[PDB]
Amino acid sequence: SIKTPEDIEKMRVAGRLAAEVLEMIEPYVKPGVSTGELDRICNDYIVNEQHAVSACLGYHGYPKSVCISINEVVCHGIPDDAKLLKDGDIVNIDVTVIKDGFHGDTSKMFIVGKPTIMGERLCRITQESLYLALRMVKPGINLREIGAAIQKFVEAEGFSVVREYCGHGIGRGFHEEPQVLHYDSRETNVVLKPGMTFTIEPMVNAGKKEIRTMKDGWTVKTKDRSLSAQYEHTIVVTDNGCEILTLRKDDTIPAIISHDE
Numbered sequence: 001s002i003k004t005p006e007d008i009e010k011m012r013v014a015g016r017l018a019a020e021v022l023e024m025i026e027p028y029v030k031p032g033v034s035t036g037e038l039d040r041i042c043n044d045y046i047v048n049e050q051h052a053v054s055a056c057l058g059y060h061g062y063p064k065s066v067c068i069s070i071n072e073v074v075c076h077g078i079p080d081d082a083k084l085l086k087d088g089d090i091v092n093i094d095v096t097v098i099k100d101g102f103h104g105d106t107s108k109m110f111i112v113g114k115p116t117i118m119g120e121r122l123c124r125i126t127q128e129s130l131y132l133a134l135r136m137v138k139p140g141i142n143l144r145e146i147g148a149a150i151q152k153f154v155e156a157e158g159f160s161v162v163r164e165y166c167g168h169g170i171g172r173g174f175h176e177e178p179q180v181l182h183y184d185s186r187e188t189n190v191v192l193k194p195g196m197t198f199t200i201e202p203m204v205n206a207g208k209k210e211i212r213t214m215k216d217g218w219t220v221k222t223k224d225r226s227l228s229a230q231y232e233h234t235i236v237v238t239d240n241g242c243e244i245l246t247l248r249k250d251d252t253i254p255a256i257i258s259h260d261e
């Protein structure tokens, strides 16, 4: 699907709101706070101030407003009032907002209190694998190349790439074509074109790539219980590159990546 300039403008707004949620929640990610409380703050902010709504709530039955994953949890962790954060924890908060009918999906890592050396390294490499993919996006490039580039980098830095979950198209629909794998697959063959909008959300494990899903049907963990990190951005392919729709002040990459001279 190719988004019109109208659709794209609406996605800038939605993406911006999703990013502002992460920028707002940051000071609250402290030792002692529960993930259930972090979820309420995000939701109250999304509904009461941004006047938008979470796309996560109700999606295939998802019970909360944002996904919060800690340490070995790979993704889709469910906020809970009894789960408290502690020093060393690495935490991902994934936000998806719907505004004016369009989605904005983004997530970032937060390290609680005193960081662990490997925890910091894992988050750093994960974010760079996303940045690397983002600087690649431009018409002509194949999604298979993007996934191969992410995997090559991640593996060269001593980590692994989760295969089961991937990025995805997005717009009026939460998940739309195409699938955005973060590794090289023979299944992938998609030449990017301007107007396409999708997400890139690499999940990187400190240990092995294998994962497992808990009985709740949502919580995904690393099979070997090693740490897992993830960063995600929503973008739109431009005539000569791409525009990040969910950029935050702490991002060290500009919103528009143009390959023009």
Ligand SMILES: CCCC[C@H](N)P(=O)(O)O
Residues within 6 Å of the ligand: 056, 057, 059, 062, 067, 075, 076, 094, 095, 096, 105, 165, 199, 201
């Ligand atoms: C609550 C459903 C999870 C939706 C996540 N944003 P993704 O599908 O990008 O992991």
Ligand SMILES: [Mn+2]
Residues within 6 Å of the ligand: 105, 106, 167, 168, 199, 201, 232
């Ligand atoms: Mn996503």
Ligand code: NA
Residues within 6 Å of the ligand: 069, 070, 071, 072, 073, 074, 075, 090, 092, 227, 228, 229, 230
């Ligand atoms: Na994790």
